[model samples]
Target: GAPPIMGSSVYITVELAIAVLAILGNVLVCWAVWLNSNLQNVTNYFVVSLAAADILVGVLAIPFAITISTGFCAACHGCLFIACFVLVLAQSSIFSLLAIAIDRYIAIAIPLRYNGLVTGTRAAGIIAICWVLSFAIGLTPMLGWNNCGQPKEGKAHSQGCGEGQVACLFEDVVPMNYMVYFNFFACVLVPLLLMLGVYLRIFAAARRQLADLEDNWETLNDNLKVIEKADNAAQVKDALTKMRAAALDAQKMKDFRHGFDILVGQIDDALKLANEGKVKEAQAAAEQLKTTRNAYIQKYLERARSTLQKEVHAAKSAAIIAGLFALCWLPLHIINCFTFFCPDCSHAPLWLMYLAIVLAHTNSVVNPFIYAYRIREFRQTFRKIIRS
Candidate 1:
């Protein structure tokens, strides 16, 4: 008789607009990653897989959602089928996010072994597992775990439609026990909590490395300054020995020893000159060594600073992405908990349900922009793609 309130033009238009943006944004993400070799890493492969899931949301889930919201699939099990499809995509998104978190943890915690452990073939195998697990989780309700045959005591199943016809609302078709237990608790919350622990470990590891770098830099600076200021040959040789000690310590931690090894050899050669009492030659050699060592130290410092900077930025980006995803989807999953957990209480308002659904879809829309803003490789590729 009357169309469902959520099937009104306002909801339809808003969802349609979100769908267009989500599809376009995630497609650009996939394209940019495809075009740039720099984006072809284990972590980025998961990112692209996430993009693909979002693309499917826009392409398949959104239309099916509209169908369900309209309450128009009243003839048969169309709504449950569509719901399963949407669930599959949503589950895939979460699994991809979890995989990304694990990938980052491995990369940060065991950087030396990362490339060997997470080869492209291994990453592809993991991706396959993500999809397979998502499908298995999503299809559980469709495989006879739903509320299709059961009738509530007070509610009339065919109030609006003809006798014996089914109402296609989510609550009427899908059981809330599965939503609360399997979907929300098992699929969503647990992975997010694990990601939290993993990121904390990553941050702790980074802080340790940063402390080491700072200590090394300060020790190296003071030792180099002593070498620069010493006047007599014995004083100069003593300062050089101190600098060599500092270099050895730095190398023990970070392997900045290649240039330091050469620098120590040159300083020993200058000391030999000093021993022969070749005053002008020793002074010239010392001066040239000072300039060369400064250049090498500056280069090493820059490399260390830039590498640490990139790692920190990448970690920040991944954390933010995961946080936003939680923010967007948590509301819907929380709302889902009310069906069985608080059955006597009044259900969530229709408008609030609509808001939560829209919020979940908004996650797909914002991800590409986040990547462009936070990641340099994505930004460069996006710029080139835009101009072309």
Candidate 2:
């Protein structure tokens, strides 16, 4: 019996639809990065490149898969070339993902060092290196690891007998062992595992950091309330000391100066009044001071809380992307492994392979939604672009 064709027209349509969306979606991602300064960060640098890889999937891989599936490319050794191109894409995508995971880890684990370490120039260099390595790995099969030779004569020729063939079916040309061992195990699986570990650490680190931040906020908030009362002259002195200590330890200590100076002046004015024997009048002025002081500190605290929430949201968005990437790609690799180790069994249906292919392609389409759509600035830019 002959091997499977590219798949039914139904499969073909779905594949092309995904390809169209992938191209359109990722181009929008690039556009968002281009027009929006906020999207232009060291982190978004990786995302844009990742979008580039996905766009290439639509522009190159899906179309080539269509051609190879129809067996038209088999005549000119297009089989090997298509395989090479796809390998490059696959490696490029995974490497980009690994880079993203590492970038997020650095941002969370040692935020102070993040800017210096992951600079724009360094990010560009890293993106270039990933492509270079992808080419080296993707084109390795073309250097003669493939089974693209003359087909053997006989009733005993197995499915992967690309010894003498004209078609560019994946199993017909590419060796299953390479798919299972090098491509799946080394290239895909290892990076995925590392990303898992990195994400786990990022979650834990983010939790710990948020806890510390909230604890600091509570300390300063309580101390500020006591200082605002200012009833007893001696007690006011002790409260000011406590408030100063808390402010010094605040993460953004410099920002406190705006309202902090006002608080200090009020307390000083009341204390001087009391020392001059105007106790009743000083207490009245102290009451007058509370409203303004409370207003300023409350505004500052609201801004701080919003900033904290944004940090957590960013971390969660990145984690969601990593999780979706694994879910989309793992089935295909598992299918590859199944075919490699269980070659004799005809139970591995051709439709399953086609479905796996569709699933992998779906991954290329979904990333922009996960990463870019979650960002408020990106959404703002997108809305503006749509209106314009």
Candidate 3:
């Protein structure tokens, strides 16, 4: 017999809430980004595309999942419809996440050319491709190219009876296990490899820049100390000129020590956060670190005023974006992997699924807020859009 519907009603309610928030939040993000000219940047374009995909999932997929979980499959057009919808939605979500990673790769690797390459028209083209690919991939099951047949075992079979002395049909066209392999490659391996490549390169570039900033600060510190020592020697009528040089060197050394300590502290904290599995927190810490490091660099610049600050700022943003990207997808992948490895173990508590759903859905709402909080231009544009 089918499980009692009322017992799982809370889960359905929670799913519905997540779907609604995803739809509303992403819709607002799309509106805010599209309507405002200031928010029309290459990075924002990718963000808007992701929001659109999430909204589609919320609108088309989640409610059906809730209906199935509520023990109402037979109340609709039978089990086959539910199976098809679930397969399609799951595939679409995976493809959308892959698109996000690819977009990030482009933005970080060729930042100088990102603006020119990822225009609004180009972004729309990429988004269209994602949907088309997702649709084609999702339709494979319906066309008998995949093994997404309705479950044949235990509960699914006993709950309802239709054709072939079975409640649902199974396809022999493709083995059921192969779909598992396909999902592993498409959802986990490919995206992880791509993101890893981009982030590693970004980190290398950032490290080089930080090293240069440190060396320059040291040189400036040495010069200031030499001047200070010469001033002290002049009071004693010694080789006052040489003493002046010594004092200047001493002052420079003091400034170098102060700045070096600040920069080193920032670097240590960043590395620590990365190791602690708090990548997003680490990225936020990077912002403060950059500011502290930049203050010393600014003192070193002392009217030279090169474009180093912009470079460092962009690096910090990349770190934060990378962190958020990992957070957005990691929990879901880990849970999925757990389910695959322990298909019949029942080791993962029900609460864990609930938590995964919550964390996964949160990415949709959180992305917009990250943009608004970190970018003053985005905030200004958002306010103007809201006011008007």
| TM-score of each predicted structure versus truth | 0.83, 0.78, 0.62
**TM-score, cand. 1:** 0.83
The Cα RMSD in angstroms, rounded to one decimal, for candidate 2 relative to the true structure is: 5.0
Error of 1 at 19 (Å): 0.8
Whole-model lDDT, candidate 1? 0.79
Write the residue-wise lDDT of candidate 2 on 1-388 in tens digits. Answer: 5334433677779989999999998998899899988789878888888889899999999987777666442432566788668779888888887888888888868778888888999899999999999998887778878876543224113333344445456676787788889888888888889988987888788777666656656765565466555566566555545545554555345656767677556656766775675655666655555565476665665676676567668877877876787888889888777777886867567678778888888988887777557887877877788789
Candidate with more favorable, higher lDDT: 1 or 3: 1
lDDT of each: 0.79, 0.74, 0.55
Best-to-worst ranking by lDDT = 1, 2, 3
Q: List the residue pairs that clash in candidate 2.
A: 149-163, 150-163, 150-164, 151-163, 151-164
Residue 320, candidate 1: alpha-carbon lDDT = 92
List candidate 2 segments past 4 Å from native.
1-7, 72-78, 149-166, 217-247, 252-255, 258-302
| Candidate 1 residue-wise lDDT, 79-147, digit = tens | 578777878888888888888878877887788888888888888998999899888899888778887
Better of 1 and 2 by lDDT: 1
Candidate 2: minimum summed lDDT over ten consecutive residues — where?
A: 151-160
